């Protein structure tokens, strides 16, 4: 069945979103610090 | 404006999804271990 494929696809999408939020966090750190 | 509100809403939704994936992970650890 493909429940585990669906789960892994959704997980990868969520991880990608979290990468973008961490991208933003570090941009904001640089504005704060420099 | 509301970009930062939208971002925090999306982030909370993604963190909630990761909590569910970690819930599943621990269930599967117990099936593997016990
Ligand atoms: Na599968
Ligand atoms: Na805002």
Cβ density class A1-34: b for 16+ within 10 Å, e for less: eeeeeeeeeeeeebeebeeeeeeeeeeeeeeeee
Cα separation values, B1 from B8, B11, B18, Å? 13, 17, 28
Method for this entry: X-ray
Cα(first)–Cα(last) distance of chain A, in Å? 51
Q: Give the range of the structural domain holding residue A19, as residue numbers without chain letter.
A: 1-34
CB neighbours of residue B10 within 10 Å: 13
B7 touches A21 (CB < 8 A): yes
Residue B14 C-alpha, separation from nearest chain A C-alpha, in angstroms: 6
Sign of dihedral through CA atoms A1, B17, A13, B27? negative
Q: How many domains does chain A have?
A: 1
**A contacts of B18 (beta carbons < 8 Å):** 14, 18
Final resolution, Å: 0.9
Copy the structure tokens of residue A21. Answer: 């939020």
> What does residue B2 show for φ and ψ, rounded to 5 degrees?
-120, 10
Q: How far is C-alpha B7 from the geometric centre of its chain's CA atoms?
A: 16
Number of helices (H), then strands (E), in chain B = 1, 0
């Amino acid at each position: 069945s493909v429940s585990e494929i669906q789960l892994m696809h959704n997980l990868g999408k969520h991880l990608n979103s979290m990468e973008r939020v961490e991208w933003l966090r570090k941009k904001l750190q640089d504005v704060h610090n420099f």
